[PDB]
Amino acid sequence: TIAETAKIREVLIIQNVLNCFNDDQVRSDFLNGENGAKKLENTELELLEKFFIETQTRRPSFIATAQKSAELFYSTINARPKSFGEVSFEKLRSLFQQIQDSGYLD
Amino acid sequence: TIAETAKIREVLIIQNVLNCFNDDQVRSDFLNGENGAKKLENTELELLEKFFIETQTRRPFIATAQKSAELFYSTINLRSLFQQIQDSGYLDKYY
Known part of the structure; x- marks a missing residue:
């Protein structure tokens, strides 16, 4: 129960985190490394945008989008060595962890 | 891998389903049992409303995330209502 809920x-x-990144001021603080946001490179921001696009589900097939999104989340939270863009899912997981652990969005 | 991904x-x-159900025309169809939607009663309406509210995470955060995750956990292990809506195909025709 604990492990699955986590x-x-x-x-x-x-x-x-991805939804907060739709805000432009948020994006700018990470691009500029200001106001307590960790500096992120263009490449990192682009990764976050790509993952956001590809994890959305959509009614047109819908099940295809849900399955694709589920596989992407599985690979991320299990830190697989498979590539997502130019980094591993392990690296992608760490980016989300670093953003969350920084407390900036709180 | 298969079971966790599922x-x-x-x-x-x-x-x-929840995000579609906040469209006023979708909710109208469900409350009336029209255009392919199965008729919802106040009890199921209330279930969807409270589930939506309790599964939203919000930056004032981790308390809201844990509460939402616990409700999703309890549900996927409400569950019949979501599966019936998905099985109905209504949302696949609506868009």
Whole structure:
């Protein structure tokens, strides 16, 4: 129960982090490394945007989008060595962890 | 891998159903049992409303995330209502 609930919790946290990144001021603080946000490179921001696009589900097939998103979350929260863009899912997981652990969005 | 990915997918499908259900025309169809939607009663309306509220995470955060995750956990292990809506195909025709 604890381990499975923690996996769902990580998915929800990633979803929230990505949703905060839709805000432009948030994006700028990470690009500029200001106001307590850790400096992120263009490449990192682009990774976050790509993951956001590809984890959305959509009614047109819908199940195809949900399955694709579920596989992406699985690979991320299990820190797989498989590539997502130019980094491993392990590296992608660490980016979300660093953002969450920084407390900037709180 | 298969079993864990399926649990994540069920969470994603529930979230989608909820996000569609805040469209006024979708809710109208469900409350009336029109255009392919199964008729919802106040009891199921209340279930969806409270589930939506309790599964939202919000930066004032980890308390809201844990509460949402616990409700998703209890549900995927409410569950019949979401599966019936998904099985109905209504949302696949609506868009």
